[PDB]
Design a binder for these strands. Structure first.
Lengths: 109, 109
DNA sequence: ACCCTAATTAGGGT
DNA sequence: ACCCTAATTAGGGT
Protein backbone atom coordinates (compact mmCIF):
# COMPACT_ATOMS: atom_id res chain seq x y z
CA UNK A 1 0.00 0.00 0.00
CA UNK A 2 1.08 3.54 -0.91
CA UNK A 3 -0.44 7.02 -0.55
CA UNK A 4 -0.90 8.47 -4.04
CA UNK A 5 -2.75 11.56 -2.78
CA UNK A 6 -0.27 14.13 -4.25
CA UNK A 7 -0.47 12.53 -7.73
CA UNK A 8 -4.25 12.08 -7.46
CA UNK A 9 -4.52 15.79 -6.65
CA UNK A 10 -2.72 16.68 -9.89
CA UNK A 11 -4.68 14.29 -12.10
CA UNK A 12 -8.15 14.86 -10.65
CA UNK A 13 -7.50 18.63 -10.72
CA UNK A 14 -6.42 18.35 -14.39
CA UNK A 15 -9.65 16.50 -15.27
CA UNK A 16 -11.67 19.23 -13.46
CA UNK A 17 -9.72 22.10 -15.09
CA UNK A 18 -10.13 20.80 -18.64
CA UNK A 19 -13.93 20.55 -18.13
CA UNK A 20 -14.47 16.80 -18.72
CA UNK A 21 -14.85 17.33 -22.47
CA UNK A 22 -11.88 15.09 -23.37
CA UNK A 23 -10.55 11.68 -22.52
CA UNK A 24 -7.83 11.26 -19.90
CA UNK A 25 -5.04 11.85 -22.44
CA UNK A 26 -5.59 15.58 -22.39
CA UNK A 27 -5.30 16.00 -18.60
CA UNK A 28 -2.09 13.94 -18.94
CA UNK A 29 -0.69 16.19 -21.73
CA UNK A 30 -1.55 19.15 -19.49
CA UNK A 31 0.35 17.73 -16.46
CA UNK A 32 3.30 16.65 -18.60
CA UNK A 33 3.71 20.19 -19.96
CA UNK A 34 2.94 19.25 -23.56
CA UNK A 35 3.13 21.67 -26.48
CA UNK A 36 0.54 19.48 -28.27
CA UNK A 37 -2.02 21.15 -30.55
CA UNK A 38 -4.70 19.08 -28.77
CA UNK A 39 -4.34 21.28 -25.68
CA UNK A 40 -5.60 24.87 -25.87
CA UNK A 41 -3.21 27.70 -24.94
CA UNK A 42 -5.43 29.14 -22.18
CA UNK A 43 -4.59 26.05 -20.10
CA UNK A 44 -0.82 26.58 -20.31
CA UNK A 45 -1.47 29.56 -18.02
CA UNK A 46 -2.69 27.33 -15.18
CA UNK A 47 -0.28 26.81 -12.27
CA UNK A 48 -0.58 23.00 -12.54
CA UNK A 49 0.49 22.90 -16.21
CA UNK A 50 3.69 20.86 -16.54
CA UNK A 51 3.80 19.97 -12.83
CA UNK A 52 3.55 16.23 -13.56
CA UNK A 53 6.72 15.92 -15.66
CA UNK A 54 8.34 13.68 -12.99
CA UNK A 55 6.17 10.79 -14.15
CA UNK A 56 5.92 9.34 -17.67
CA UNK A 57 2.79 9.50 -19.85
CA UNK A 58 2.60 5.72 -19.44
CA UNK A 59 2.68 6.04 -15.64
CA UNK A 60 -0.13 8.63 -15.64
CA UNK A 61 -2.22 6.32 -17.85
CA UNK A 62 -1.65 3.33 -15.52
CA UNK A 63 -2.53 5.60 -12.61
CA UNK A 64 -5.75 6.79 -14.27
CA UNK A 65 -6.80 3.15 -14.80
CA UNK A 66 -6.46 2.44 -11.05
CA UNK A 67 -8.41 5.61 -10.20
CA UNK A 68 -11.21 4.36 -12.49
CA UNK A 69 -11.14 0.93 -10.79
CA UNK A 70 -11.32 2.68 -7.38
CA UNK A 71 -14.29 4.80 -8.54
CA UNK A 72 -12.73 8.30 -8.56
CA UNK A 73 -12.97 8.62 -12.34
CA UNK A 74 -15.22 7.09 -15.03
CA UNK A 75 -15.10 6.93 -18.79
CA UNK A 76 -18.31 7.53 -20.74
CA UNK A 77 -19.50 7.78 -24.33
CA UNK A 78 -20.14 11.37 -25.44
CA UNK A 79 -20.87 13.40 -28.60
CA UNK A 80 -20.92 10.64 -31.18
CA UNK A 81 -20.22 6.98 -31.93
CA UNK A 82 -16.44 7.58 -31.77
CA UNK A 83 -15.84 9.61 -28.63
CA UNK A 84 -15.54 9.04 -24.92
CA UNK A 85 -14.59 11.39 -22.09
CA UNK A 86 -13.13 10.87 -18.63
CA UNK A 87 -15.04 12.47 -15.76
CA UNK A 88 -14.89 12.81 -11.99
CA UNK A 89 -17.43 10.59 -10.21
CA UNK A 90 -19.29 12.01 -7.21
CA UNK A 91 -16.68 10.26 -5.07
CA UNK A 92 -13.92 11.98 -7.06
CA UNK A 93 -15.62 15.40 -6.68
CA UNK A 94 -15.98 14.87 -2.92
CA UNK A 95 -12.31 13.98 -2.57
CA UNK A 96 -11.21 16.93 -4.71
CA UNK A 97 -13.47 19.36 -2.85
CA UNK A 98 -11.74 18.38 0.36
CA UNK A 99 -8.29 18.24 -1.23
CA UNK A 100 -8.76 21.85 -2.35
CA UNK A 101 -8.53 22.96 1.33
CA UNK A 102 -6.15 20.40 2.87
CA UNK A 103 -4.12 17.40 1.67
CA UNK A 104 -6.01 14.13 1.34
CA UNK A 105 -4.64 10.63 1.22
CA UNK A 106 -5.55 8.25 -1.58
CA UNK A 107 -4.10 4.84 -0.74
CA UNK A 108 -3.73 2.16 -3.44
CA UNK A 109 -3.31 -1.65 -3.12
CA UNK B 1 13.90 -21.37 -49.97
CA UNK B 2 12.62 -18.29 -51.79
CA UNK B 3 13.98 -16.06 -54.58
CA UNK B 4 14.26 -12.49 -53.29
CA UNK B 5 15.95 -11.14 -56.46
CA UNK B 6 13.33 -8.46 -57.22
CA UNK B 7 13.57 -7.07 -53.66
CA UNK B 8 17.38 -7.34 -53.66
CA UNK B 9 17.46 -5.37 -56.90
CA UNK B 10 15.51 -2.53 -55.25
CA UNK B 11 17.52 -2.47 -52.02
CA UNK B 12 21.01 -2.90 -53.52
CA UNK B 13 20.08 -0.32 -56.18
CA UNK B 14 18.94 2.04 -53.41
CA UNK B 15 22.23 1.67 -51.52
CA UNK B 16 24.18 2.51 -54.70
CA UNK B 17 21.89 5.40 -55.66
CA UNK B 18 22.43 7.11 -52.29
CA UNK B 19 26.19 6.69 -52.71
CA UNK B 20 26.84 4.42 -49.69
CA UNK B 21 26.87 7.59 -47.62
CA UNK B 22 24.34 6.33 -45.08
CA UNK B 23 23.24 3.32 -43.10
CA UNK B 24 20.38 1.23 -44.50
CA UNK B 25 17.68 3.60 -43.16
CA UNK B 26 17.97 6.11 -45.99
CA UNK B 27 17.84 3.47 -48.75
CA UNK B 28 14.62 2.17 -47.10
CA UNK B 29 13.06 5.65 -46.76
CA UNK B 30 13.80 6.07 -50.47
CA UNK B 31 12.17 2.74 -51.42
CA UNK B 32 9.14 3.35 -49.23
CA UNK B 33 8.49 6.78 -50.79
CA UNK B 34 9.25 8.85 -47.69
CA UNK B 35 8.67 12.60 -47.44
CA UNK B 36 11.51 12.75 -44.87
CA UNK B 37 13.80 15.78 -44.59
CA UNK B 38 16.66 13.25 -44.35
CA UNK B 39 16.18 12.36 -48.03
CA UNK B 40 17.13 14.97 -50.65
CA UNK B 41 14.46 15.92 -53.21
CA UNK B 42 16.65 14.97 -56.18
CA UNK B 43 16.06 11.30 -55.24
CA UNK B 44 12.27 11.64 -55.41
CA UNK B 45 12.72 11.96 -59.19
CA UNK B 46 14.31 8.50 -59.41
CA UNK B 47 12.19 5.70 -60.94
CA UNK B 48 12.81 3.42 -57.93
CA UNK B 49 11.46 6.00 -55.41
CA UNK B 50 8.42 4.58 -53.62
CA UNK B 51 8.60 1.20 -55.40
CA UNK B 52 9.19 -0.72 -52.15
CA UNK B 53 6.01 0.58 -50.47
CA UNK B 54 4.41 -2.88 -50.37
CA UNK B 55 6.90 -4.06 -47.72
CA UNK B 56 7.20 -2.52 -44.25
CA UNK B 57 10.28 -0.68 -43.00
CA UNK B 58 10.65 -3.58 -40.53
CA UNK B 59 10.67 -6.11 -43.38
CA UNK B 60 13.31 -4.20 -45.36
CA UNK B 61 15.49 -3.94 -42.24
CA UNK B 62 15.17 -7.71 -41.61
CA UNK B 63 15.91 -8.26 -45.32
CA UNK B 64 19.03 -6.06 -45.18
CA UNK B 65 20.25 -8.17 -42.24
CA UNK B 66 20.04 -11.34 -44.36
CA UNK B 67 21.93 -9.62 -47.22
CA UNK B 68 24.71 -8.65 -44.81
CA UNK B 69 24.92 -12.24 -43.52
CA UNK B 70 25.01 -13.58 -47.11
CA UNK B 71 27.74 -11.08 -48.07
CA UNK B 72 25.96 -8.69 -50.47
CA UNK B 73 26.12 -5.75 -48.04
CA UNK B 74 28.60 -4.72 -45.30
CA UNK B 75 28.55 -2.18 -42.50
CA UNK B 76 31.64 0.06 -42.40
CA UNK B 77 32.72 2.46 -39.65
CA UNK B 78 33.19 5.93 -41.22
CA UNK B 79 33.42 9.68 -40.38
CA UNK B 80 33.44 9.60 -36.60
CA UNK B 81 33.03 7.25 -33.64
CA UNK B 82 29.20 7.30 -33.85
CA UNK B 83 28.74 6.49 -37.54
CA UNK B 84 28.57 3.47 -39.78
CA UNK B 85 27.47 3.23 -43.39
CA UNK B 86 25.99 0.32 -45.28
CA UNK B 87 27.89 -0.46 -48.50
CA UNK B 88 27.76 -2.96 -51.36
CA UNK B 89 30.39 -5.70 -51.12
CA UNK B 90 32.27 -6.72 -54.28
CA UNK B 91 29.78 -9.58 -54.45
CA UNK B 92 26.80 -7.23 -54.09
CA UNK B 93 28.12 -4.92 -56.78
CA UNK B 94 28.83 -7.78 -59.23
CA UNK B 95 25.31 -9.07 -58.62
CA UNK B 96 23.74 -5.62 -59.20
CA UNK B 97 25.87 -5.08 -62.33
CA UNK B 98 24.33 -8.25 -63.82
CA UNK B 99 20.86 -7.42 -62.42
CA UNK B 100 20.95 -4.11 -64.34
CA UNK B 101 20.71 -5.93 -67.70
CA UNK B 102 18.63 -9.04 -66.84
CA UNK B 103 16.81 -10.28 -63.72
CA UNK B 104 18.94 -12.23 -61.28
CA UNK B 105 17.87 -14.65 -58.61
CA UNK B 106 18.94 -14.21 -55.01
CA UNK B 107 17.83 -17.33 -53.12
CA UNK B 108 17.50 -17.07 -49.33
CA UNK B 109 17.35 -19.93 -46.77
C1' DA C 1 25.95 9.86 -42.67
C1' DC C 2 24.82 5.40 -36.54
C1' DC C 3 20.90 3.87 -33.24
C1' DC C 4 17.42 4.75 -29.84
C1' DT C 5 13.67 7.08 -27.72
C1' DA C 6 10.09 10.67 -26.68
C1' DA C 7 7.11 14.01 -28.68
C1' DT C 8 4.12 15.27 -31.99
C1' DT C 9 0.82 15.05 -35.99
C1' DA C 10 -2.33 13.20 -39.97
C1' DG C 11 -5.52 10.00 -41.11
C1' DG C 12 -8.65 5.93 -40.99
C1' DG C 13 -11.77 3.64 -38.25
C1' DT C 14 -13.64 2.11 -32.87
C1' DA D 1 -13.47 15.85 -27.53
C1' DC D 2 -11.93 8.50 -28.84
C1' DC D 3 -8.64 4.54 -30.20
C1' DC D 4 -4.28 2.50 -32.40
C1' DT D 5 -0.71 3.09 -35.77
C1' DA D 6 2.50 5.05 -39.23
C1' DA D 7 5.37 8.84 -40.16
C1' DT D 8 8.24 12.40 -38.98
C1' DT D 9 11.60 15.20 -36.24
C1' DA D 10 14.74 16.57 -32.35
C1' DG D 11 18.31 15.26 -29.05
C1' DG D 12 22.27 12.90 -27.65
C1' DG D 13 25.58 8.78 -26.60
C1' DT D 14 29.49 5.80 -27.58
Amino acid sequence: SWDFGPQAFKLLSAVDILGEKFGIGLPILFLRGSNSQRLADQYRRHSLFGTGKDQTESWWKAFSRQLITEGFLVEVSRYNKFMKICALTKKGRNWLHKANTESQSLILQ
